[model samples]
Target: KTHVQLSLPVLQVRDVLVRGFGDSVEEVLSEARQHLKDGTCGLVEVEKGVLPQLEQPYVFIKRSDAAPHGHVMVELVAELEGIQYGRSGETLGVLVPHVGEIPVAYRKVLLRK
Candidate 1:
């Protein structure tokens, strides 16, 4: 069969800061989870027309107020029927086709509760 073209959306988050004082590692992890739930630190939007390939790395271009260039590199690990799995920075996430569905990737590693 002949192929036309392929496109995928990249779900990404930028510039997140999570912090917790006097908390254990597990507690801080929970706090990070909360950040994602509350949208404090989570996938904010989906970028269209970016095709992610297997075993290839994609760059998540993040703009910051303090810094000019702060980008995270995401390496694609797997591809399912409707989801694309990859790791950005220290966390992993899945790229879904539709909106409103929480893709599992965010670009940060901080402690908070």
Candidate 2:
């Protein structure tokens, strides 16, 4: 195991902006889906022999940009796997071995008074 700071926003939802390689929104989503399924979505941070896994998920529908480039912003959620511990002895969260984050936002509702 590698010693690294595991951090994520408590909000639970994340929006990612991606530039497609001259592809359509459907194609981008397809590619992203494959990446998530294949377990290659994690961005590897190499320091020594240990590798830390990081993931970015595609949650909401892709928004197309008016620009020429195939630009889109995707909303994603954070999913974690493996043995996670907090200050107490209780296990925080466990997920798949290779799979890191999942593309689903932590849904929240706000009511206006």
TM agreement with the true structure for every prediction: 0.23, 0.23
Top candidate when judged by lDDT against the true structure: 1
Model 1, 15-66: lDDT tens digits are 2121121133334334434433454433323334323321112212222112
Q: Model 2: per-residue lDDT, tens digit, 1-113?
A: 11112222111112222312113334444564454345433222223422132232212221121111221222222212432211122111211222344444221211010
TM-score of 1: 0.23
Model 2 accuracy (lDDT, Cα): 0.26
Query: lDDT at 29 for candidate 1?
Result: 38
Off by over 4 Å in 1: 1-22, 42-113
Question: What lDDT score belongs to each candidate, Candidate 1 first?
Answer: 0.30, 0.26
TM-score of 2: 0.23
| Inter-residue clash pairs, candidate 1 | 19-111, 19-112, 20-111, 93-104
lDDT of candidate model 1 versus the reference: 0.30
Query: Runs in model 2 with CA error above 4 Å?
Result: 1-22, 43-113
In terms of lDDT, the poorest run of 10 residues in model 1 is 59-68
